[PDB]
Amino acid sequence: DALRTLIRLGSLHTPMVVRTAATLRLVDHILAGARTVKALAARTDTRPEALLRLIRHLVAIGLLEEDAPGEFVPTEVGELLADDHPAAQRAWHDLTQAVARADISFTRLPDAIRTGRPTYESIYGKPFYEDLAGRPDLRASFDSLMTTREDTAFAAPAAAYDWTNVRHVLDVGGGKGGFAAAIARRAPHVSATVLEMAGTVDTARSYLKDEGLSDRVDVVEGDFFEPLPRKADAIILSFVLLNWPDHDAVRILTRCAEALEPGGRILIHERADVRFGSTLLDLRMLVFLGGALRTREKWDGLAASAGLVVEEVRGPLVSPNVPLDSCLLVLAPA
Amino acid sequence: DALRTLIRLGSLHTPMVVRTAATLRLVDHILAGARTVKALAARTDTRPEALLRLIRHLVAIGLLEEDAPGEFVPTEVGELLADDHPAAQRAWHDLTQAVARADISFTRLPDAIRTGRPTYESIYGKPFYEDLAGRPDLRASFDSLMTTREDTAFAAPAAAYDWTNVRHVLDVGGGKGGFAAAIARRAPHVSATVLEMAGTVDTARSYLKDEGLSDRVDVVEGDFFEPLPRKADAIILSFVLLNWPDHDAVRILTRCAEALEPGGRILIHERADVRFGSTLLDLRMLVFLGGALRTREKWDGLAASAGLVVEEVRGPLVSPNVPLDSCLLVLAPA
Ligand SMILES: CC[C@@]1(O)C[C@H](O)c2c(cc3c(c2O)C(=O)c2c(OC)cccc2C3=O)[C@H]1C(=O)OC
Ligand SMILES: CC[C@@]1(O)C[C@H](O)c2c(cc3c(c2O)C(=O)c2c(OC)cccc2C3=O)[C@H]1C(=O)OC
Ligand SMILES: Nc1ncnc2c1ncn2[C@@H]1O[C@H](CSCC[C@H](N)C(=O)O)[C@@H](O)[C@H]1O
Ligand SMILES: Nc1ncnc2c1ncn2[C@@H]1O[C@H](CSCC[C@H](N)C(=O)O)[C@@H](O)[C@H]1O
């Protein structure tokens, strides 16, 4: 009992079997009509004997079941590996896309606990975002994964703040601009600017065009460790600061403080440290990037170092469906 | 629900957190009196902030619990990570010992499914047993791990066969000689020979000496792909053949057939393919070694190729305590 529990918790084969199934698009091939192990093997370009041994573990953990002899089909849980499922778990487990690939850094977790430093570079040759800057496929899949974290498409954070006195929003590291878009739909008088890295700026521009928002949201390529491209009344850091150790996060916050208009505020949208998934995201930040999730008291110190104070934390954001784990910290000049 | 289930099954951070805790000997340090995170950090030579983030996940998965503020203790499941626990799970999860280290091969499982070939060499530079031959620390921990698979110390397989008409036993790849020892205690008239690799032969010799069996069990250093050192009435292959692809297993079986006395038998002691843990061991063999677990029908073909027939399979072996997953196949000249 206790022995079986410990063995399952410590098992490396099971998560790699799940990720291999996702990378091979196994459930998609089954749902597209691959009824036999020979057809599945052919569509995935794998050895049939080896694929069957993978399938045997997929059956044992309840992702596949045998309907007829030799005919394997997804269970209710396996169906979440279909590529069009809205939770996007296939892509989140795909070893050729940015996050599951980055998760290999966990194989060197002892080094990260001994040093406090990320292990991603020791495995892939460059730190996380520099590796993405050299790999257009990983840059693109990362940006797409970041748009599948929550089901409101930033509607819930955009609704948690009053935009009446805001004329311009600067979305610092704003990904493909989904947050800037949600504010624009919410608040017709606001204009916005997204500051992002090379590669990402082009998909942000295409996304904002296709929303019909090109006239209201601009995109600037740049580095948020440098002086920001313009001033704004609200400056958004959405899942940015957790990517960075304290001294780097203070540098970013300081650049934002310097770009605030009088009366402006900085909005940090992030999962706060205090259930489910908190330790996964925190340890991801450690081994990918050297970042961390932060408590309120930790945020107080970071803000003070940047000439700011935490005015308000708008607690875990609500959706009609699956709850957002994230919060909105509102920061003002000290 | 289904989403949380899939996310837990696909999680790489949880098994690496367990293995990191085992490698750091975290539970041993707690039980030896490390009551604070600062004391634990000092004994494990880790950063206190990073160690706490590891501990937070260890609490979330139920291996540790907080007794007093800042004082972490093993749960009933965490206690199995104590190094002296008889299930030996600490060593089985220790990333500096041979098996948990080998499990990193699972990070390249897609390659193994595409090619049918093991991934261990692509990661560590040499195939499994050649890597052990160059690493005395891994050779030794592997040999020790192989003595902790079952709780009877080979008493159950030794009791599953009638030794009356056996005068000499050859234990081919017999590890530290634990199986030869169990037969010797069971059957006072039998002498035995263990055939093993360099390094392992010395710990076999020390173990057999310390059992008081040096006069009854010899150890020979050699290669079981070469002609065997002598003939015997029973030739044991205990958790050997699953290490090898079919053609290599046939070579071994053939060497054994050539060394059988008239009326002799070959005993294969292995987990047969047909619950819990079957797919783990099978996929381990794939990615470590290119081996596999085999069904009865597969064994029939291998035996026939070696000039043998399966006479009898003595089904899953029984213990008074935790059941042995293994079986004993009895093979005779065709
Ligand atoms: C179901 C929750 C969630 O889908 C969304 C959660 O927000 C979240 C996840 C993963 C990542 C991030 C997340 O925010 C990142 O912010 C992130 C990052 O920061 C910009 C830089 C690199 C990688 C990641 C990352 O892999 C997922 C999770 O399971 O974690 C518990
Ligand atoms: C609780 C079961 C068990 O403790 C014992 C089970 O017999 C078993 C295990 C691990 C290994 C082997 C086992 O036989 C090997 O034979 C082996 C091997 O073969 C000689 C060569 C390299 C690695 C291994 C190996 O890691 C464990 C397990 O959990 O697997 C489901
Ligand atoms: N120096 C830098 N300058 C500008 N953006 C950077 C940067 N370093 C990292 N980033 C960006 O920071 C982002 C963090 S991922 C978060 C994206 C988006 N805000 C969201 O909530 O979904 C990435 O898109 C990355 O491109
Ligand atoms: N070419 C070879 N010649 C002899 N032994 C070999 C060998 N290749 C691998 N081995 C041995 O095969 C063993 C398989 S592990 C099984 C050990 C033991 N029979 C038990 O049941 O516990 C290892 O000890 C390894 O040293």
Numbering used by the authors:
A (entry chain A), B (entry chain A): 15 to 288, 297 to 356
Task: Give the authors' words.
DnrK is a canonical S-adenosyl-L-methionine (SAM)-dependent methyltransferase that catalyzes 4-O-methylation in daunorubicin biosynthesis. Recent studies have uncovered that DnrK is bifunctional and catalyzes additional 10-decarboxylation as a moonlighting activity. Here we have taken advantage of the natural diversity of anthracycline methyltransferases and employed extensive chimeragenesis to probe factors that govern catalysis and substrate recognition.
To overcome the experimental uncertainty, we replaced the critical phenylalanine residue with glycine in DnrK RTTD F297G. According to our mechanistic model, removal of the bulky hydrophobic side chain would allow bulk solvent to access the active site and prevent 10-hydroxylation. Unexpectedly the mutant displayed moderate 10-hydroxylation activity towards 4 and 5 with 38 and 79% conversion, respectively, with limited reactivity towards 6. The introduction of G297 had induced a disruption to the α16 helix secondary structure and, consequently, lead to rotation of a different phenylalanine residue (the preceding F296) towards the active site. While cavity analysis shows an open conformation also for this structure, F296 is ideally positioned to block the solvent channel in the closed conformation. The mobility is possible due to the Y342L mutation in R2, repositioning the neighboring D345, which removes bulky aromatic amino acids present in DnrK (Y342) and RdmB (F346) that prevent arginine–ligand interactions in the wild-type enzymes.
